[PDB]
Amino acid sequence: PVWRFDDRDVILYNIALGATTKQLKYVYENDSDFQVIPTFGHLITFNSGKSQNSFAKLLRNFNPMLLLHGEHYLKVHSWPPPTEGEIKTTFEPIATTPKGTNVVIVHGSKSVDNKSGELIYSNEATYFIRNCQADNKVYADRPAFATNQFLAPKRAPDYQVDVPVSEDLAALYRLSGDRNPLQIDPNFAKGAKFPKPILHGMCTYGLSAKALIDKFGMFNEIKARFTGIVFPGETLRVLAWKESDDTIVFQTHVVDRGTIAINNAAIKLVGD
Amino acid sequence: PVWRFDDRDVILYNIALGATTKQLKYVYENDSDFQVIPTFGHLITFNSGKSQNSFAKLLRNFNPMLLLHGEHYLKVHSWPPPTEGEIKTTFEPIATTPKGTNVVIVHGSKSVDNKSGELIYSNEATYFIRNCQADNKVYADRPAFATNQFLAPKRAPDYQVDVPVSEDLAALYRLSGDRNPLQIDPNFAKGAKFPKPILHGMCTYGLSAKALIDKFGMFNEIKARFTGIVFPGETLRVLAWKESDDTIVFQTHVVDRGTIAINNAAIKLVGD
Ligand SMILES: CCCCCCC[C@@H](O)CC(=O)SCCNC(=O)CCNC(=O)[C@H](O)C(C)(C)COP(=O)(O)OP(=O)(O)OC[C@H]1O[C@@H](n2cnc3c(N)ncnc32)[C@H](O)[C@@H]1OP(=O)(O)O
Ligand SMILES: CCCCCCC[C@@H](O)CC(=O)SCCNC(=O)CCNC(=O)[C@H](O)C(C)(C)COP(=O)(O)OP(=O)(O)OC[C@H]1O[C@@H](n2cnc3c(N)ncnc32)[C@H](O)[C@@H]1OP(=O)(O)O
């Protein structure tokens, strides 16, 4: 379950989240401040091989076509996140909860340096799966940040910014590891009850992450709920509330349809 | 000297050349017509290890910073080009010719399938190197197509298309293998007497090739002279003439400055 990556991966990922040559630190591997947007650490989800599917042991009548990314939580334990090297990931179940004819499963992971043993990333993916069953069980504990609902305060955001999503971004973003046909193949997306392919939840998430970093700087911790779908070609609106010296609460909206794509979300800033 | 590549490399390359999700044949690995734009075969130039620099052994006063891609010839011998596998490449010098304080050097290569021995690609790369010296020598015979002038006919073009070059295109394109700082680092480009980083010769070429394919179909042989620089953010204009059942002659102009970027160029269409 070893993920091998280098600056090519870093740059291909950063570019997909909107890094331009105005920011050589994200797109040029020899730049003095070369760095990867920390949501990159989620990619153990897709590049750890067969063991990454171990959540499915707990599901009855699982059709991957009907799976949606429901929430994601990511912690970077070792700062800054590496731009090259080797990471070994170990997976474990956290919880399964029936929601009507749906299931919500929480899949937990730890990602270490495969050379040294050093803890680098921790992830908790939550899937919302339609027409699926599972036992009502809790298996493991979670950090508070991961279950914080991070309700936006009832006041205007301290910061707001629009982020265009290219019609072709899913095709580029998916090269980072998530080959799900759902986001590229119209006939597959049609079988999952969408009128055309949708945008990877983790893409919206990274686009939001990137926008927040330009404004508030780097973070080592992130959690969010995917509350509504995004299509390639649409324009996102990232709303940000600075709730402490440390913590930025946010929402990502779809300008075009007036829905909320990301809710119950926050980042925790690395300090100085 | 083994290049390992797969659908990811293919799609990453296709996108940099302007392939969109309207063309799933170029950007989705499970499309039944999944295929790579054949200029992909030049990439042995960058993905074959240290032996690929062997041309420099014939050079005196060589500074890589002062190197420019001068001409390029590619033949595809095995149709269609593979979208995954392993290719072993071997290189030979073809010619060195001093032009005043410059050197023109031609670097020959054959790229086989590493498992089978099958000739996949052949390349002839011509570099124009400023402030360089070399002997006046001819080492090898060359195909007619590689040395053809392909004079643009006097009549009006049969076909004409504009191809906009994103200002960020260099940053994506170079992930296909060519890591030269000339195209990304403004400081290095300044050392080369360019007011901003230039676009990769092979990108202009691939962009041009892509546009030619959308109109004329697939080709298995291509040759072009790089006669003018291109800057990312500029608009290319491809000019084309059908000169036989086999052969399409072209040029690529830079609209913004009224220069000729690619001249003395043709493609050989794939048969029936
Ligand atoms: C190899 C590993 C593979 C793993 C990665 C897989 C590949 C990935 O590429 C997949 C993707 O990227 S898919 C795209 C990203 N996600 C989305 O777009 C989801 C957008 N949100 C929605 O369509 C709805 O919130 C929707 C449809 C999810 C739910 O909305 P509703 O149908 O209106 O459900 P609702 O009636 O609101 O809620 C029922 C109960 O579920 C809880 N809940 C709601 N949304 C949730 C969510 N997003 N995550 C977790 N739980 C959620 C509610 O609390 C409710 O519970 P309760 O009744 O106890 O209050
Ligand atoms: C393993 C790793 C290897 C890596 C390899 C490559 C890595 C890459 O990153 C490199 C790139 O992509 S660099 C960018 C691409 N190239 C360009 O943009 C060049 C555009 N062309 C020019 O600026 C000029 O034609 C220019 C500057 C090239 C020449 O024009 P001039 O200085 O005006 O010279 P001129 O008076 O026109 O001619 C002098 C003699 O040189 C010959 N010549 C001219 N252009 C040539 C060319 N493009 N190719 C070959 N020979 C050329 C002329 O024939 C003339 O010789 P003669 O008088 O005997 O005929």
Swiss-Prot record, chains A, B:
<feature type="binding site">
    <location>
        <position position="69"/>
    </location>
    <ligand>
        <name>(3R)-3-hydroxydecanoyl-CoA</name>
    </ligand>
</feature>
<comment type="function">
    <text>Second trifunctional enzyme acting on the beta-oxidation pathway for fatty acids, possessing hydratase-dehydrogenase-epimerase activities. Converts trans-2-enoyl-CoA via D-3-hydroxyacyl-CoA to 3-ketoacyl-CoA.</text>
</comment>
<feature type="binding site">
    <location>
        <position position="70"/>
    </location>
    <ligand>
        <name>(3R)-3-hydroxydecanoyl-CoA</name>
    </ligand>
</feature>
<feature type="binding site">
    <location>
        <position position="127"/>
    </location>
    <ligand>
        <name>(3R)-3-hydroxydecanoyl-CoA</name>
    </ligand>
</feature>
<feature type="domain" description="MaoC-like">
    <location>
        <begin position="152"/>
        <end position="263"/>
    </location>
</feature>
<feature type="binding site">
    <location>
        <position position="227"/>
    </location>
    <ligand>
        <name>(3R)-3-hydroxydecanoyl-CoA</name>
    </ligand>
</feature>
<feature type="binding site">
    <location>
        <position position="178"/>
    </location>
    <ligand>
        <name>(3R)-3-hydroxydecanoyl-CoA</name>
    </ligand>
</feature>
<feature type="binding site">
    <location>
        <position position="228"/>
    </location>
    <ligand>
        <name>(3R)-3-hydroxydecanoyl-CoA</name>
    </ligand>
</feature>
<feature type="binding site">
    <location>
        <position position="180"/>
    </location>
    <ligand>
        <name>(3R)-3-hydroxydecanoyl-CoA</name>
    </ligand>
</feature>
<feature type="binding site">
    <location>
        <position position="201"/>
    </location>
    <ligand>
        <name>(3R)-3-hydroxydecanoyl-CoA</name>
    </ligand>
</feature>
<comment type="subunit">
    <text>Monomer.</text>
</comment>
<feature type="binding site">
    <location>
        <position position="226"/>
    </location>
    <ligand>
        <name>(3R)-3-hydroxydecanoyl-CoA</name>
    </ligand>
</feature>
<protein>
    <recommendedName>
        <fullName>Peroxisomal hydratase-dehydrogenase-epimerase</fullName>
    </recommendedName>
</protein>
<comment type="similarity">
    <text>Belongs to the short-chain dehydrogenases/reductases (SDR) family.</text>
</comment>
<feature type="binding site">
    <location>
        <position position="99"/>
    </location>
    <ligand>
        <name>(3R)-3-hydroxydecanoyl-CoA</name>
    </ligand>
</feature>
